[PDB]
Structures are given as structure tokens and as C-alpha cells.
């Protein structure tokens, strides 16, 4: 039939991509990197512990001054901490008690949150009155909100479980671009060093490269067997790293069309659900579901440390902008800052 | 070191003290409330209703899609799950498979379930008229006998009452041959008539807490 003719064409197009991608693959990253001296064993220890949440924590974000911090728990409160000296600067009640994300503003004036509400809210931190109000509410997605990041003091990108991402306008309040193409719930996104490209992983074991200026997928990547939980761009603009729920992490190369390295072990069975990078880019920190985190070596793929000290599932993970400390959150409501 | 610097530290401490005071006030209202989930399947409204001193707080999920493998993990700390077994093809079996997934889930392996076989109009009148409900789908219904403890109140063809106790035992086979006594199931019949079912929820959450305390004291 007519429908069957189109399907046969897609198989031919798939093979030509495979042939070209296989042709360029000449060596492996392991062969070139097997001359560099291995890094020593790395040990850390907690410096600051923060208390005051009543339920499990779901999200956190560092400010662009390496001192302030925001958090969100499944209780209905957002708390702003001071890292150097344990203090509280704000504590904001929420209209919905089931949140799943929070963010920070490059300038330091607004904070956002989202959840099963399906709506994103923005709060004005600098009010001449003194209290904290609600600036605007953004409505239009049909599913639970997963991620959201500030691009401009007037623009913000969001992703939801209705298999769609969008770009919003804070002033008017309506979408300006809509992205389609995933066949599964979008779980995370990360912005480039500039503000012109970003990536997104979903429950279809896939990732895509998008463009804010014109909506379209520049490159589609494949590899992980199961659903993908976290993702983080490398500090160069030419690669990224991903973590899926089959006890694996992979490092894809955006400069060309293919994957480079894998980080796997036989003993580990649980999921990742957390990934990040250090400032130089030679140290990969990935959370895990067995109440612990690990430290790897992205240029050697050999484990070099652990992080024990959480008695429940690790949910969030972040590294400071200048690179001085590592913040970790868990379902035990005990944020701990490591060094 | 300077006049302004000294006031800075004192200013922060004063603000922290005010914040921590109301956090202690909110800790008492969070401890005294029980949370429920209305998983009616087989618009995201949250309603706070209160019976006497007891305040309850349930959540209904009507805006999501039919893929629950990701947003169902957010209800790890709820007291109980109210599953409404209410509305051709197989409809009892589709609800039957959904129960087993929840019952065996890794993060929901310590949560009790309250069953409401609603739509009492679903009857055995269809056995002799139109298409029968339990006709070919369950071939073992032929050689089944009612329990000796069946109590038909207004009564009717024993046939209807006999068919009722066949469905109840099907959910109990899944919920018994499983993990140890950290959770149970509370079947009930609701004739889809009035809101005297709040009473059943009040009387079922009381056994859930009571049996939890008797386990840590070895009783």
C-alpha cells in the first residue's frame, strides 16, 4: 500500500547514515588515552550540613556567585541558604505541595518552580515592599513539568511529560516556539555555554540537538538500552554526558556524529538519576540509587573515589560555578556540601 | 572588623531566628495530617476535608497520560491508596494486572490499598440477557462454591451473591502470596448510593496505623 512504500524508504536512509558513521570510526578513545598518567585516589569529606526540610528533596541549583543556593522539597516550601555560614534568607510557601524542579537566575532576582501543577511560577526576590510575591504564571502544557532553565531575564525554556519542550516569554505570557519529535516523556535538558543550542533526553533512549533560533533537530543520538534520567554538557561545547536507568553512563561527541566512551561495572545494578562535571572536565560525578555517589575519570574510564554519607536515595547533584564545592541532596532531607 | 560589618552578622542571625520560629509551627500541622491518593482507573484537584479532629488530604490525578511508570513514585509517603474498581472487551483483567504492578513495586512495597468495587449495577442479570460477563473469560467460574460466611442482606439470586465473592477472592490471591505483613488490602462493596463511604475510609485508616504499632513492639 501507499503507507508501506514510505516505510521501506526509511530503512534505506537508516543504512546510509550507519555506513557513513561506521566509516569515520577509525580508532577508539581508549587507545589514544592509554599514555597519560592516572590521577591519584581522591577523597573528600563533608564541610557544611544544612537542616530544616520536613520531607524528601527533589531539586536544587547554585547561584552565579558560589555562595547562595535554593532547594525544593515535597512539602511545599522553598528555602534559600547561605553556604559559607549556615543561615536562611527566605522561606516561601507554595500553593501546590508536589514540586519536581527549581531554578536560579543569572542576575539573581527571580526563582522558578514546577511539578504535577503542570504550570511554572516565577517569584520576585527584589521587592521594595519587603515580602515575596508572585510575578507571573505560565500555562499551556498538558503534562507534569520536569525541567526549566533561565536563558534571559525575559526568556526561559521548559520541558514536560507531554513529550514536548517550549520557549516562553515572561512579559506577554505566551509561547514563542514549540519543539516536537520525542515519543516519550522528556526528563531533562541542559543549556550550552552560550544560549543558542541545548540537548534533551527522554524515555525513548534517545537524545536530540535543538536550536532556539529555528525549531528543528540537528542531530539524533542513540545508545542507552533503557530510559534516560540525567544529562550534562561538557565544558567545551563539543560533547556531553548522559546517565540512564540501566546502570550505565555514556559520553557522546557532538563535534562528530558518534559516541566515544562508556562507564560501566558489573557490580553496580541500580540507576544513575544524577550526573555532573568538574571545571577542568576530567572528573565525572554521578549519583546512584543505592544511597551513594561515585567519582570517575572521563579520560580513563576508571573509578577513583566514592561519596558515602547518605542513608536514603540520592536525588540531586550540583557542582559550583568556580569549582570549590560539591552539593548533594537526597530523600533524607539532609543537604550536604562536600569538598 | 568595621562598624557596618558587625551589624551584618547580627542582622543575619535575627532573620534566621524569625524563620526558624514559624518552621516549628508548620511542623505540627504537617504531623497531624493524613494523606491519600485517589487512583481511579483500570483536573489535578486536591481536596481537604475533615472528620472531627482528624484532617485528611487526598490528591486526584486526572490531567496526566496513561504512562504511570514515572509520576507514581511521588506518592511514597501516603497513608493508603484508594483504588476505585469501576468502568466490549476485558475490563476486570485489565484492572487485575494493574493491581499486581503496584503491589510489587520497589518504592511502594510498604503501602496498603483500599478496594472499592463500585458500580453495583454490574450484576448477574446479564447472565441470562444479552452477553454474560463471567462466561468465557474465567473458565474456572463453573466449579466454584460460595463461602460458608456469605451474608446476603437484602438478598437476591444467590447467583448474584455467589458471583460477588468470586471477584473478591481473585484480588486476594495476588495480595496474600507476596511479601510479609508490612501491608494489607481492605476490600469493600459500595452500592454507588451515598457518601457514607467517608466512614469506611475513617475506619480503615485506623486499622492501618494500629497494626503498624503492634509490629514494632512484637505483639
Amino acid at each position, epitope marked *: 500500500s501507499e503507507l508501506d512504500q514510505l516505510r521501506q524508504e526509511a530503512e534505506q536512509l537508516k543504512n546510509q547514515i550507519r555506513d557513513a558513521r561506521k566509516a569515520c570510526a577509525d580508532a577508539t578513545l581508549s587507545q589514544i588515552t592509554n599514555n597519560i598518567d592516572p590521577v591519584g585516589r581522591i577523597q573528600m569529606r563533608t564541610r557544611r550540613t544544612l537542616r530544616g526540610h520536613l520531607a524528601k528533596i527533589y531539586a536544587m541549583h547554585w547561584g552565579t556567585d558560589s555562595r547562595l543556593l535554593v532547594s525544593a522539597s515535597q512539602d511545599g516550601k522553598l528555602i534559600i541558604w547561605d553556604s559559607y555560614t549556615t543561615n536562611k534568607v527566605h522561606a516561601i510557601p507554595l500553593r501546590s505541595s508536589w514540586v519536581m524542579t527549581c531554578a536560579y537566575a543569572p542576575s539573581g532576582n527571580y526563582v522558578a518552580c514546577g511539578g504535577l501543577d503542570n504550570i511554572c511560577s516565577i517569584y520576585n526576590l527584589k521587592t521594595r515592599e519587603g515580602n515575596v510575591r508572585v510575578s507571573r504564571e505560565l500555562a499551556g502544557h498538558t503534562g507534569y513539568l520536569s525541567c526549566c532553565r533561565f536563558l534571559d531575564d525575559n526568556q526561559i525554556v521548559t520541558s514536560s511529560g507531554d513529550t514536548t519542550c517550549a520557549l516562553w516569554d515572561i512579559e506577554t505570557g505566551q509561547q514563542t516556539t514549540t519543539f516536537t519529535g520525542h515519543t516519550g516523556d522528556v526528563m531533562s535538558l541542559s543549556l550550552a555555554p552560550d544560549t543558542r543550542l541545548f540537548v534533551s533526553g527522554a524515555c525513548d533512549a534517545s537524545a536530540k540537538l535543538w536550536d532556539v533560533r529555528e525549531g528543528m533537530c540537528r542531530q539524533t543520538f542513540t545508545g542507552h*538500552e533503557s530510559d534516560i534520567n540525567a544529562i550534562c554538557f561538557f565544558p567545551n561545547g563539543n560533547a556531553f554526558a548522559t546517565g540512564s536507568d*540501566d546502570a550505565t553512563c555514556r559520553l557522546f561527541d557532538l563535534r562528530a556524529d558518534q559516541e566515544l566512551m562508556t562507564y560501566s561495572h558489573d557490580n553496580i*545494578i541500580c540507576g544513575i538519576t544524577s550526573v555532573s562535571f568538574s571545571k577542568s572536565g576530567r572528573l565525572l560525578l554521578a549519583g546512584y540509587d543505592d544511597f551513594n555517589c561515585n567519582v570517575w575519570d572521563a579520560l580513563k574510564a576508571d573509578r577513583a573515589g566514592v561519596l558515602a554519607g547518605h542513608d536514603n536515595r540520592v536525588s540531586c547533584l550540583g557542582v559550583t560555578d568556580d569549582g570549590m564545592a560539591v552539593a548533594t541532596g537526597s530523600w533524607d532531607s539532609f543537604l550536604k556540601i562536600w569538598n | 572588623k568595621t562598624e557596618d560589618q558587625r551589624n551584618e552578622e547580627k542582622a543575619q542571625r535575627e532573620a534566621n531566628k524569625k524563620i526558624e520560629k514559624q518552621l516549628q509551627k508548620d511542623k505540627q500541622v504537617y504531623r497531624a495530617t493524613h494523606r491519600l491518593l485517589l487512583l481511579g482507573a483500570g483536573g489535578i484537584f486536591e481536596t481537604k476535608f475533615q472528620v472531627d479532629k482528624v484532617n485528611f488530604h487526598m490528591f486526584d490525578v486526572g490531567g496526566q497520560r496513561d504512562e504511570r511508570r514515572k509520576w507514581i513514585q511521588c506518592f511514597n509517603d501516603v497513608t493508603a491508596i484508594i483504588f476505585v474498581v469501576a468502568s466490549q472487551t476485558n475490563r476486570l483483567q485489565e484492572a487485575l494486572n494493574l493491581f499486581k504492578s503496584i*503491589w510489587n513495586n*520497589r518504592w511502594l512495597r510498604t503501602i496498603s490499598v483500599i478496594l472499592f468495587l463500585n458500580k453495583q449495577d454490574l450484576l448477574a442479570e446479564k447472565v441470562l440477557a444479552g452477553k454474560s460477563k463471567i462466561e468465557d*473469560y474465567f*473458565p*474456572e467460574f463453573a466449579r466454584y462454591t460460595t463461602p460458608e460466611d456469605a451474608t446476603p442482606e437484602p438478598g437476591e439470586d444467590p447467583r448474584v451473591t455467589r458471583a460477588k465473592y468470586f471477584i473478591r477472592d481473585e484480588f486476594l490471591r495476588i495480595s496474600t502470596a507476596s511479601g510479609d505483613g508490612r501491608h494489607y488490602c481492605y476490600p469493600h462493596f459500595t452500592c454507588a448510593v451515598d457518601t457514607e463511604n467517608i466512614r469506611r475510609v475513617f475506619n480503615d485508616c485506623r486499622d492501618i496505623i494500629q497494626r503498624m504499632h503492634l509490629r514494632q513492639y512484637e505483639l
Partner: nanobody
Amino acid sequence: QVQLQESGGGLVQPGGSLRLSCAASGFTFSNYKMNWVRQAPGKGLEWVSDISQSGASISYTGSVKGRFTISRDNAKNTLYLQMNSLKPEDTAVYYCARCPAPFTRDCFDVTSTTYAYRGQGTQVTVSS
């Protein structure tokens, strides 16, 4: 890169037997639990049978019990289904599923309007 493909089927008299075969690649066949899901000529989607990682635990819907059997062979990565004595109501499109996570006992998505890990089905008709 994950892909599932089914083969086998045709037109049969109201009485007899058939067999179905599915080939898989990409992931590790040992660690996942499979399923057999069938549609209907215009009537939702419903579950037929499923197996475990090893050939030890089985289950059946009940409508077809004592007639269908399911077998797994972890050497060529093939899933089989053998039929017996089919009736006029046994005509639909058959698919093959796979649970979302490897080392689990509960599946929350094998049946859905859209499934990311289900193949494209095959048509079988029992005519006279």
C-alpha cells in the same frame, strides 16, 4: 537502535494451529522479561501472556488457556508462541512487548496507546 520484528501467520480454517516468531537485537536478551500483546479488529489493546527471565514462571489471560504455550530460548534471541485449536474470535494483530527495566518483577507500561519498546505487529485471520 532497539528494534523488534515478528514473522509468521496467514489464513487458516476454523480449526488447526499456527506458530509465531520474533527476533530481537540491540539490548541484552537475558535480563528482560517479555510479553505477548494483541489488538482486536477495532477493540482496544489487551494482554495475552508473558514469561520470566528464565523458563520458570508463566501466565495466561484465561480466554485462551490450555491452547497456547510460550517458550524462551536464550541462545538465538527468539521468542516463540505455539497455538492450538483456534476459534473465529481469534483473529487480530499480535505484538511483542518488553518490560521497561531489566531487573524488576513489576511492569507499569507494557500496554499503552504508544509504547517505545513494542514491535510492529502481524496480521492473522481465521476465515472459512
